[PDB]
């Protein structure tokens, strides 16, 4: 099949050609919302502490 | 700044701005918001107005 036995195997290979661009950039984005889930676990308190004792 | 109610219970809370924290050295009498329980003011100390009746 010298027709499309090779030429088949661009198709499946640009896909993950453009994934492979794609997954750095999710990395790219996902550091700056952990960097959100951090800071927005502290703005609720932490001036303003009470005090129990642990049990 | 670790604190305890004279009523009751205990806390960590904070000044307003210029409420000089230097001049608060443990033995000192102060002052605390309502809402946000912080800091407000510190008082010369009390009276007890036994010793203010006589």
Partial sequence: ?55 | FIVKATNGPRYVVGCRRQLDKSKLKPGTRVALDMTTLTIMRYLPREVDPLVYNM
């Fill in chain 1, 1 to 55: 099949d010298l027709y499309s036995r090779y030429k088949k195997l661009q198709q499946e290979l640009e896909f993950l050609e453009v994934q492979e661009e794609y997954i750095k950039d999710e990395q790219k984005n996902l550091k700056k919302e952990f960097l959100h889930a951090q800071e927005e676990v502290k703005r609720i308190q932490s001036i303003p502490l009470v005090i129990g004792q642990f049990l």
